[PDB]
Amino acid sequence: SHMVGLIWAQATSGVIGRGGDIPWRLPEDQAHFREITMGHTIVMGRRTWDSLPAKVRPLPGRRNVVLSRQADFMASGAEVVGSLEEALTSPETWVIGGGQVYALALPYATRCEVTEVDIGLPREAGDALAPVLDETWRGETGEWRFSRSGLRYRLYSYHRS
């Protein structure tokens, strides 16, 4: 189909999750995730889907796609696909996690929307980590700003052909 993006929020070290939680509290990043994904397709792995609250999934106003090897998986209000390539048939897709799906998706992706949270969390065994980019990606790293709580963050908007 077409435009494949990745979206995530990471500490400066690349930690995106620890102990099965987002490792900070940042409502403005929830607003940012909505504004990027709203009206488009989101793709997630089955474990990510399983971790969302029952009354929160599917995320509203977006086509939710769950990748699973299980043909009988129940993702009420979403659709389930059994290959990544089938999950990218939409005109605009944002891959939202987790690490297994980001690995599969990275070769197809031509945009990354990232939030860096200014927090010092050196990586530990078991952490969920950010996809690793390289020098063929280009774009803007925004200015630091404070959240309402005083937590600082900035935005990356990168692209490649």
Binding site for ligand ATR (CB under 6 A): 45-48, 67-70, 73, 82-83, 97-101, 104
Cβ-Cβ contacts under 8 Å for 128 (sequence gap 6 or more): 15, 16, 17, 18, 97, 98, 99
Q: Between residues 36 and 101, which has the closer beta carbon with respect to ligand ATR?
A: 101
Q: Between residues 67 and 155, which has the closer beta carbon with respect to ligand ATR?
A: 67
Asked whether residue 134 is marked as a ligand-binding residue, the answer is no
Tokens, residue 155: 């935005």
Asked whether residue 21 is marked as a ligand-binding residue, the answer is yes
Asked whether residue 45 is marked as a ligand-binding residue, the answer is yes
Binding site, by residue number, is 7-9, 16-21, 29, 34, 45-48, 62, 67-70, 82, 96-102, 115
